[PDB]
Curated annotation (Swiss-Prot), chain A:
Disulfide bridge map: none
Organism: Escherichia coli (strain K12)
Assigned protein family: Belongs to the RNA polymerase beta chain family.
Domain of life: Bacteria
Stated role: DNA-dependent RNA polymerase (RNAP) catalyzes the transcription of DNA into RNA using the four ribonucleoside triphosphates as substrates.
Subunit organization: The RNAP catalytic core consists of 2 alpha, 1 beta, 1 beta' and 1 omega subunit. When a sigma factor is associated with the core the holoenzyme is formed, which can initiate transcription. The rRNA transcription and antitermination complex (rrnTAC) consists of RNAP, NusA, NusB, NusE (rpsJ), NusG, SubB, ribosomal protein S4, DNA and precursor rRNA; S4 is more flexible than other subunits. In pull-down experiments interacts with CedA. (Microbial infection) Interacts (via flap domain) with Escherichia phage lambda antitermination protein Q; this interaction renders bacterial RNAP resistant to transcription pausing and allows it to read through termination signals.
Mod. after translation: Acetylated on several lysine residues in the presence of glucose.
Shown stretch of the complete protein: 896 to 945 of 1342
Biotech utility: Co-administration of salinamide and rifampicin or salinamide and myxopyronin suppresses the emergence of resistance to both antibiotics.
Protein name: DNA-directed RNA polymerase subunit beta
From Swiss-Prot, chain B:
Protein name: DNA-directed RNA polymerase subunit beta'
Subunit structure: The RNAP catalytic core consists of 2 alpha, 1 beta, 1 beta' and 1 omega subunit. When a sigma factor is associated with the core the holoenzyme is formed, which can initiate transcription. The rRNA transcription and antitermination complex (rrnTAC) consists of RNAP, NusA, NusB, NusE (rpsJ), NusG, SubB, ribosomal protein S4, DNA and precursor rRNA; S4 is more flexible than other subunits.
First and last residues shown, out of full length: 15 to 201 of 1407
Highest taxon of source: Bacteria
Record-stated family: Belongs to the RNA polymerase beta' chain family.
Biotech utility: Co-administration of salinamide and rifampicin or salinamide and myxopyronin suppresses the emergence of resistance to both antibiotics.
Residues that, per the record, bind Zn(2+) 1: C56, C58, C71, C74
Species for this entry: Escherichia coli (strain K12)
Swiss-Prot record, chain C:
Organism, as annotated: Escherichia coli (strain K12)
Gene3D superfamilies: RNA Polymerase Primary Sigma Factor, Sigma-70 factor, region 1.1, Winged helix-like DNA-binding domain superfamily/Winged helix DNA-binding domain
Name of the protein in its database record: RNA polymerase sigma factor RpoD
GO BP: any one term: regulation of DNA-templated transcription initiation
Site description Interaction with anti-sigma factors, residues in chain: R445
Region annotated Sigma-70 factor domain-4, chain positions: 430-483
Subunit note: Interacts transiently with the RNA polymerase catalytic core formed by RpoA, RpoB, RpoC and RpoZ (2 alpha, 1 beta, 1 beta' and 1 omega subunit) to form the RNA polymerase holoenzyme that can initiate transcription. Identified in a complex containing RpoD, the RNA polymerase subunits RpoA, RpoB and RpoZ, CRP and DNA. Interacts with Rsd; this prevents interaction with the RNA polymerase catalytic core and with promoter DNA, and as a consequence, promotes transcription from promoters that require alternative sigma factors.
Alphabetized InterPro entries for the sequence: RNA_pol_sigma-70_dom, RNA_pol_sigma70, RNA_pol_sigma70_r1_2, RNA_pol_sigma70_r2, RNA_pol_sigma70_r3, RNA_pol_sigma70_r4, RNA_pol_sigma_70_non-ess, RNA_pol_sigma_70_r1_1
Biological function: Sigma factors are initiation factors that promote the attachment of RNA polymerase to specific initiation sites and are then released. This sigma factor is the primary sigma factor during exponential growth. Preferentially transcribes genes associated with fast growth, such as ribosomal operons, other protein-synthesis related genes, rRNA- and tRNA-encoding genes and prfB.
SUPFAM superfamilies assigned: Sigma2 domain of RNA polymerase sigma factors (SSF88946), Sigma3 and sigma4 domains of RNA polymerase sigma factors (SSF88659)
Sigma-70 factor domain-2: annotated span: 262-332
Location in the cell: Cytoplasm
Gene (UniProt): rpoD
Motif Interaction with polymerase core subunit RpoC, residue numbers: 286-289
Amino acid sequence: TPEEKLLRAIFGEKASDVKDSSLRVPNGVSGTVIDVQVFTRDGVEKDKRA
Amino acid sequence: EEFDAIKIALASPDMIRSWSFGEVKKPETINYRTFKPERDGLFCARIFGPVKDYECLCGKYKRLKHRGVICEKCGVEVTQTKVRRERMGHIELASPTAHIWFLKSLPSRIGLLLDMPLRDIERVLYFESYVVIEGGMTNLERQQILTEEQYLDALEEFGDEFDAKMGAEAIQALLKSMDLEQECEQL
Amino acid sequence: AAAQVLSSVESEIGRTTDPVRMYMREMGTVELLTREGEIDIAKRIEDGINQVQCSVAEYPEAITYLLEQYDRVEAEEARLSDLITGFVDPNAESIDPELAREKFAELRAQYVVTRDTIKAKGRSHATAQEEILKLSEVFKQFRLVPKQFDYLVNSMRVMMDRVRTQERLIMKLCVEQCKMPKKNFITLFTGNETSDTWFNAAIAMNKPWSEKLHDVSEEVHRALQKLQQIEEETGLTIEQVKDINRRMSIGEAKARRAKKEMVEANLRLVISIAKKYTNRGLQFLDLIQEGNIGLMKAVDKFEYRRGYKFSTYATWWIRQAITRSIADQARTIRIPVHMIETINKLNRISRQMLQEMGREPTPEELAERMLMPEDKIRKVLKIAKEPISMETPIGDDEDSHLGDFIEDTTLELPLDSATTESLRAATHDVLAGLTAREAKVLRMRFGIDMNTDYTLEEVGKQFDVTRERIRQIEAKALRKLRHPSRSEVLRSFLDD
Amino acid sequence: VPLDGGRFATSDLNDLYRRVINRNNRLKRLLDLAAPDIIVRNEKRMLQEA
């Protein structure tokens, strides 16, 4: 919308077109992680994380 | 906008055509590569409007200011998404069809208006036997059923005056040729 | 054994609505004629085709139009499109201009020697009749490609329909007006065929019921002028045209009867192929209809000169039709035939891979054996998935279906709507608090509370020709908007 | 709409309309090619059933 365009022109920030679909913790859940599990296919590399 | 009553009646073919804004011919839904509807599919963007919020099919008509501009390449009217909610389409059929729930629902109002049991109109609609629409000669009259052999035996004798069709067409011709006032007076 | 079967079925059916039984009853009446019926049907079809060819040869306007089209396509001296494949192309009982000219030389010679013999004592001369018979016998040895044969048949049908419509219009304008008998009208119309001498004879006759004729006499000649113009454009006799039309109609009726007989005889073969190909697909009725369409398309191109059985040809055509139908239809999304064939090949390979190894086929080994990149295999495995129904129960209990289980992520939510409303209200308030012309330029440049978003030159031509002054005004407005005392209320919208 | 599991969720009414349109197209192709009486009756019965 022209309002957001004017706001971006005023602030002059980059604001790259990148979605924010990260996983969050549900509300009211305060705990501790025991262990994480990363499962990928044979084509994609482990990427130094797994 | 405030309505007073709720009316219910039979729909007219021309009115159903006027309700729609295009005819659906191909049953294609989407493509396996792009999710864009076909130009003649079920939910095509040309007949039912745009998919996204004020955006054409090929993504060329940006700048939402352009409202009601028919494209030359895709032909999508730039409007809102809720337009698809309050609009419908239509299908042009080749042969007429008898409404199932008009005779299957008790007390078979079609058979009551035509003075004929349900079995007879079922045999007529399912193309099991032929029915005489209107007979000018003194041999047969309206509402006369003839089998496959009887129809061939009666067709080789006379001609150009024995009116008989198959199912929906015969019933439509009978409903068109019948007179309500004369039948009411007779009753 | 036809009437008794129908009677027993009609007496046994207790209001049954099974289409399969109805189809079996409709196809079960016609029996089979092995090694003796199909040959006779093909012979009758060939006789009808020969009769149609003779009727066309007796109609020189079709040959004239063909020669005109050939001259038009040859006048450019460079044309090798698909139109040549639709030409005559006679067989010896690829394409080259030499053989074409060699075969058309005698045809053109016969045409130019017959056109000159038209005025020889009339159109019904002995020499002219012999020349027409020779031309017809020569044309009988030329098999026409259906590509342009269908167009010629359609043109002849249109001409015949126009002639019949004119005749029916004249008959109506005569009957509905004067109540004239058909016996005393059609006879004279066929006997004279030249002028209105029959009308003068009818006027000379008493006919007390024909006194009401002056109000339609001005229209009778006006209607017959159209027939006169049609005759002048054609240039042939009405009797010969009517005879050709009747012969063509009889031939077409015989051909249609033979085709219907062949279809009724091969319905059992079609249903046998359907039973041999018993897949659920869409429905058995659609498969039977596709098989019938394939059978008709095969009959429209089948000949008995090969000395083989029609069963194999019909089976091949029905298999092709069913393959095309199952590749195009019988699925939610449309998948091309090539993609279907590739999926079938990949499945046939995976079948052997699992039989040899015992584990699910890995994409790497499948791509190595197929000699194709892994991207294509991955795309095929991703796309080849049947869509899930909308009324599938989420749990073991059939209480709640999949009707409401998907969120509506297409439209916006009240949160963003209220955020945008507050933002636009704040921007409007800021613009109202600033200078008038500054706010006007900012609204005309960006499009706040405006439909069109003007550019620099447009805002210039509207306000001031000097485009640099507009740029300075915009920059000053931006610098005043970036002031902290006025941006302390807009900094909160930094994330949005 | 595509489901969260990377698959598509179709509707039965879409399939019904597709069947009706396919039968109508078959009926039109049969009428344009002068189909026999039995085939025309069967196609009309199928269209009525659809």
